[PDB]
Every structure is written in C-alpha cells, then in structure tokens.
Amino acid sequence: ACVFFCEDAAIIGLAV
Amino acid sequence: ACVFFCEDAAIIGLAV
Amino acid sequence: ACVFFCEDAAIIGLAV
C-alpha cells in the first residue's frame, strides 16, 4: 500500500 | 481531506 | 501524473 497525507487532529501519513 | 502531489514541469499540492 | 509513496520493504515514489 501507499502513504497518503490526510486529515485525521492533523494531516498525517496514512496508510492506504 | 487528503493532499495529493501532481505535476502540471511543476509539482502541485492538490487538495482533495 | 501524480506521485505516490508506495511500498515496493522500501517505500518508493511512483508516478502514476
């Protein structure tokens, strides 16, 4: 998978 | 939302 | 195209 930068607070790396 | 980095060259941050 | 940081393990930028 990939690292998306998404709001989750703050914008963080998110594994998608 | 998530930040995507795409070229138009120049890279741009795309807000989605 | 858009650049994604994806596992390929090492995480590599892919330009989709």
Beta strands in chain C (DSSP E): 2-7, 11-15
**Helix (H), strand (E), coil (C) string for A1-16:** CEEEEEECCCEEEEEC
Identify any residues that bridge with C6 across adjacent strands, giving them in sequence order.
A2, C12
Give how far A1 is from chain B: nearest CA, Å: 15
Strands C2-7 and A11-15: unpaired
Q: Please state, in angstroms and rounded to a whole number, the distance separating the CA atoms of residues B12 and A4.
A: 15
Chains in touch with A (≥3 Cβ pairs < 8 A): B, C
